[PDB]
Amino acid sequence: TALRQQVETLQGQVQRLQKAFSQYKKVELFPNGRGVGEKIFKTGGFEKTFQDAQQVCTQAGGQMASPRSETENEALSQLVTAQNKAAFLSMTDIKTEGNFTYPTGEPLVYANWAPGEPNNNGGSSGAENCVEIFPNGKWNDKACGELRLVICEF
Amino acid sequence: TALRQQVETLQGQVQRLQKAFSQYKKVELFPNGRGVGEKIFKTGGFEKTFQDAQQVCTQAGGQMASPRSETENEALSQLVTAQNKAAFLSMTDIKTEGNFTYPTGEPLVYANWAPGEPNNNGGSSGAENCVEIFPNGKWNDKACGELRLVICEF
Amino acid sequence: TALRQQVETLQGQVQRLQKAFSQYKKVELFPNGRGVGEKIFKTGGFEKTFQDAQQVCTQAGGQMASPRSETENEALSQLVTAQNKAAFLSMTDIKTEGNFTYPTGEPLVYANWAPGEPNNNGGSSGAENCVEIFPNGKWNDKACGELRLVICEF
Numbered sequence: 122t123a124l125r126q127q128v129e130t131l132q133g134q135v136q137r138l139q140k141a142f143s144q145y146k147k148v149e150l151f152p153n154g155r156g157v158g159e160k161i162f163k164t165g166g167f168e169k170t171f172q173d174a175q176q177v178c179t180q181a182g183g184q185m186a187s188p189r190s191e192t193e194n195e196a197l198s199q200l201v202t203a204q205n206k207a208a209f210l211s212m213t214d215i216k217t218e219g220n221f222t223y224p225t226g227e228p229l230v231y232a233n234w235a236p237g238e239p240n241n242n243g244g245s246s247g248a249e250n251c252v253e254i255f256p257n258g259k260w261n262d263k264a265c266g267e268l269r270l271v272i273c274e275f
Numbered sequence: 276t277a278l279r280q281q282v283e284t285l286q287g288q289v290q291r292l293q294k295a296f297s298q299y300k301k302v303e304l305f306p307n308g309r310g311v312g313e314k315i316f317k318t319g320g321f322e323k324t325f326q327d328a329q330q331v332c333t334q335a336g337g338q339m340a341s342p343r344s345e346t347e348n349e350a351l352s353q354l355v356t357a358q359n360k361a362a363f364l365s366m367t368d369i370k371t372e373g374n375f376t377y378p379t380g381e382p383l384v385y386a387n388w389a390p391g392e393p394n395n396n397g398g399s400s401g402a403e404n405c406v407e408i409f410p411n412g413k414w415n416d417k418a419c420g421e422l423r424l425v426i427c428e429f
Numbered sequence: 430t431a432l433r434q435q436v437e438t439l440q441g442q443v444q445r446l447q448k449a450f451s452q453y454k455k456v457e458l459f460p461n462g463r464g465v466g467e468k469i470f471k472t473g474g475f476e477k478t479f480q481d482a483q484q485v486c487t488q489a490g491g492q493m494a495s496p497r498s499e500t501e502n503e504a505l506s507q508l509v510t511a512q513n514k515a516a517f518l519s520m521t522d523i524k525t526e527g528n529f530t531y532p533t534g535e536p537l538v539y540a541n542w543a544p545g546e547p548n549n550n551g552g553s554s555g556a557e558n559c560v561e562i563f564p565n566g567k568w569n570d571k572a573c574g575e576l577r578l579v580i581c582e583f
């Protein structure tokens with residue numbers, strides 16, 4: 122009976138927590154984050170080389186963005202559009218040229234290459250083994266040593 | 276009895292959640308957010324026309340700021356003061372000139388017009404049917420096509 | 430029995446809350462925050478005098494940073510490194526020259542003074558009674574009237 126009073130009080134605390142949490146997720150993601158399913162993408166609003174971006178995302182507790190669907194890709198395109206800066210994705214063809222994989226090593230389940238890309242031609246930058254996403258959502262292979270918007274996936 | 280052990284464990288988890296949540300609300304609102312009652316105002320730190328600001332706030336899961344009291348208005352004034360940029364509020368007199376309403380269509384329950392305002396005179400901008408808030412908290416009717424600080428209400 | 434169903438449902442809600450909360454802490458701290466133990470440090474990304482920084486942190490619900498260990502100090506150094514701007518710490522020697530204390534008045538349990546510091550010589554700024562932290566983590570006594578990165582502790 123007293124136990125009953127305790128779980129009804131827990132129900133009220135839990136529901137208030139859920140309400141307040143729904144609100145603070147929306148507050149937190151405004152404006153530099155987007156949620157898709159269980160994933161959250163968030164930009165730090167600065168640019169780094171691919172290598173430094175990788176360290177930054179891991180150190181923060183996440184990883185670089187691996188868009189596995191149109192919906193996830195659109196969310197990233199929304200972030201780079203707002204920031205007006207193209208962002209590095211997680212994927213590279215470093216192990217095998219022309220074959221872009223996630224950092225786990227599996228092949229892409231989704232791809233949105235711009236016309237003509239990937240082309241592995243960064244001019245004076247040499248080969249292009251990383252991937253940038255444009256405001257329109259399209260992808261281009263870019264040299265990993267370039268500076269691009271950092272977006273992390275959590 | 277075992278059930279008793281389970282709710283006492285729930286009590287501990289709930290309380291730790293409440294403690295950590297109180298802290299992460301303060302962390303999140305620092306420095307671009309303010310809480311007042313059940314409302315949270317947060318600025319994105321960029322400027323947009325009223326129309327674009329409306330889309331941005333809705334898309335993010337909220338709406339534009341509708342200050343219904345002195346306390347809510349002060350919180351907004353704190354945000355525009357920090358950003359040093361005047362912000363659009365939610366209210367317009369688009370439906371009826373001189374009669375400012377919330378987006379629901381109800382009349383203001385609170386108003387803080389600067390001296391002489393509203394005046395519906397944006398010079399070359401034409402009529403003024405939206406509302407900007409100044410660092411001092413005072414209001415001026417401004418053309419909706421101007422760019423002003425975006426603050427959203429959640 | 431029905432009570433049993435209610436606490437098992439609470440267990441599921443609590444665990445989902447804990448999972449989502451772990452994720453939104455990491456999202457929130459990226460990139461301007463760091464957690465150490467029960468503390469969270471977060472920079473606002475602007476500069477203020479020591480006096481104004483104190484007001485800002487208190488008003489936000491926290492206080493200025495009081496690094497009490499190497500780990501806490503490193504977290505601050507990570508924030509000023511990212512921002513490329515030295516930050517004020519909480520400690521002053523205002524009450525007694527050469528004796529730096531926390532705002533509670535207790536002496537430092539940890540210190541990381543740069544070589545030669547503290548020296549109480551701000552040139553035209555006069556005496557130096559506050560403390561700045563550099564990107565390398567080292568400390569220098571600086572005049573309290575200077576503008577430095579604002580980091581708050583929550």
Ligand SMILES: *[C@@H]1O[C@H](CO)[C@@H](O[C@@H]2O[C@H](CO)[C@@H](O[C@@H]3O[C@H](CO[C@H]4O[C@H](CO)[C@@H](O)[C@H](O)[C@@H]4O[C@@H]4O[C@H](CO)[C@@H](O)[C@H](O)[C@H]4NC(C)=O)[C@@H](O)[C@H](O)[C@@H]3O)[C@H](O)[C@H]2NC(C)=O)[C@H](O)[C@H]1NC(C)=O
Binds near residue numbers: 220
């Ligand atoms: C770029 O480089 C990568 C790395 O080598 C290559 O990745 C491979 O892509 C192929 C083609 O789609 C893919 O094969 C398909 O796998 C599907 C899923 O089932 C497979 O994995 C499960 C485990 O999750 C196994 O239990 C299944 O039996 C399948 O096992 C695969 O079998 C093949 C031999 O038939 C073997 O070569 C693979 O190593 C092995 N994979 C794994 C993970 O065990 C199937 O439904 C479908 O029918 C295909 O078999 C394969 O999984 C990828 N390999 C790896 C290592 O991930 C790309 O081929 C290459 N090129 C491109 C264009 O991306």
Ligand SMILES: *[C@@H]1O[C@H](CO)[C@@H](O[C@@H]2O[C@H](CO)[C@@H](O[C@@H]3O[C@H](CO[C@H]4O[C@H](CO)[C@@H](O)[C@H](O)[C@@H]4O[C@@H]4O[C@H](CO)[C@@H](O)[C@H](O)[C@H]4NC(C)=O)[C@@H](O)[C@H](O)[C@@H]3O)[C@H](O)[C@H]2NC(C)=O)[C@H](O)[C@H]1NC(C)=O
Binds near residue numbers: 371376381382
């Ligand atoms: C600017 O433009 C707007 C839109 O037309 C006008 O808004 C109206 O403001 C008036 C004046 O304050 C306001 O009337 C007061 O309403 C108070 C609340 O009670 C009313 O609403 C409840 C429901 O919440 C009803 O159950 C009550 O019976 C009241 O109903 C109102 O009755 C009047 C006729 O007497 C009718 O014209 C209204 O449409 C109707 N409102 C609603 C929502 O049902 C009362 O305590 C108080 O005594 C006043 O009656 C009225 O509610 C506003 N109308 C709307 C559509 O929201 C402004 O008049 C106009 N000018 C300014 C200066 O803002």
Ligand SMILES: *[C@@H]1O[C@H](CO)[C@@H](O[C@@H]2O[C@H](CO)[C@@H](O[C@@H]3O[C@H](CO[C@H]4O[C@H](CO)[C@@H](O)[C@H](O)[C@@H]4O[C@@H]4O[C@H](CO)[C@@H](O)[C@H](O)[C@H]4NC(C)=O)[C@@H](O)[C@H](O)[C@@H]3O)[C@H](O)[C@H]2NC(C)=O)[C@H](O)[C@H]1NC(C)=O
Binds near residue numbers: 529536
């Ligand atoms: C800069 O300015 C400050 C402010 O005056 C001075 O702070 C003092 O530092 C000393 C030296 O370390 C420190 O004394 C040590 O305290 C340790 C902890 O135990 C003391 O506090 C507990 C309560 O938490 C008491 O129950 C203990 O009995 C100790 O009490 C202290 O006793 C001394 C007399 O023996 C007395 O003068 C203190 O006021 C008193 N402190 C308190 C808080 O009650 C001990 O383990 C250790 O053996 C030392 O005694 C002392 O606590 C600090 N005082 C204050 C007010 O915080 C610095 O000396 C000065 N210089 C520097 C270099 O920082």
Ligand SMILES: [Ca+2]
Binds near residue numbers: 214218241250251262
């Ligand atoms: Ca390549």
Ligand SMILES: [Ca+2]
Binds near residue numbers: 238242249262
């Ligand atoms: Ca290319």
Ligand SMILES: [Ca+2]
Binds near residue numbers: 373
């Ligand atoms: Ca008007």
Ligand SMILES: [Ca+2]
Binds near residue numbers: 393396397403415417
């Ligand atoms: Ca006006």
Ligand SMILES: [Ca+2]
Binds near residue numbers: 526549556557559570
């Ligand atoms: Ca001094």
Ligand SMILES: [Ca+2]
Binds near residue numbers: 548551569
């Ligand atoms: Ca000095």
